[PDB]
With several copies, the nearest count.
Chain A
Amino acid sequence: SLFSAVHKIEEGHIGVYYRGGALLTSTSGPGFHLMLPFITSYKSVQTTLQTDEVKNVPCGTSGGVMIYFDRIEVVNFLVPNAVYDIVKNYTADYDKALIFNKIHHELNQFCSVHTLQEVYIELFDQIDE
């Protein structure tokens, strides 16, 4: 009954509501909030700085040798006003389809132009940028 209506949003998140699969154009900030009892589903998307990583990323150097980055972490944040558009276009898991599904391709494209030494030592500080 009213148990489902209430829901905590947590600080630093924004809640997006689905009306049986359709995204309402109303978003709720942190704090106590109330929605419809059973025909609306809320999910909170983080709008503060957050981090996530991908492990064992291959990288083929210009010399034909393959080197595997153990871990590549990306720290990102989403402005609160664009949350509605972001979730509408790419759902609540936008990060996987926007960043971490192409990290490996970007790394391989960068590596293909640089040699093993060039990536391992010389321009290591430039890989991040």
Chain B
Amino acid sequence: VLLYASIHKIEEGHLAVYYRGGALLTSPSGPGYHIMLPFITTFRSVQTTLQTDEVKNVPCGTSGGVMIYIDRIEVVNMLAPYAVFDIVRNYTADYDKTLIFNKIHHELNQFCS
């Protein structure tokens, strides 16, 4: 049914970004009920409130040449709602893997060497 296919809900603290044929429509939607074209358009909700994630067993080569493994490094971040469009236009929705948690290990290694 058209209603079942199109009707979608955006959780509080999330901003919705839609895609029609792969393009990025310049019209994000805030929390609440919304209407999108049923089949062609598909939505993904990016969290804008405080968010947490973690990386495990990060190596660290100390200046003495010995290896120490930090078990868990957690980063908590957030992005302003206005920047969702650009931050999704670049780096796609999964901006965290390619902006924070892929560089965590290298930055820590550089610091602790």
**Cβ-based interface call for A88 (8 A):** yes
Given contacts A32-B23, A121-B113, contact A22 B10 (CB under 8 A): yes
Once the chains bind, are B61 and A12 in contact (CB under 8 Å)?
Answer: no
What total count of A-B pairs have CB within 8 Å?
84
State the Cβ distance, B51 to closest chain A Cβ, in Å: 9
Once the chains bind, are B109 and A124 in contact (CB under 8 Å)?
Answer: yes
Given contacts A101-B52, A120-B61, contact A12 B110 (CB under 8 A): no
Q: How large is the interface on B (under 10, 10 to 19, 20 to 34, 35 or more residues)?
A: 20 to 34
Which B residues are closer than 8 A to A by beta carbons? 9-13, 19-24, 31-33, 40, 49-50, 52, 61, 63, 65, 88-92, 98, 102, 106, 109-110, 113
6 nearest A-B residue pairs (beta carbon): A32-B21, A31-B23, A10-B22, A22-B32, A8-B22, A20-B9
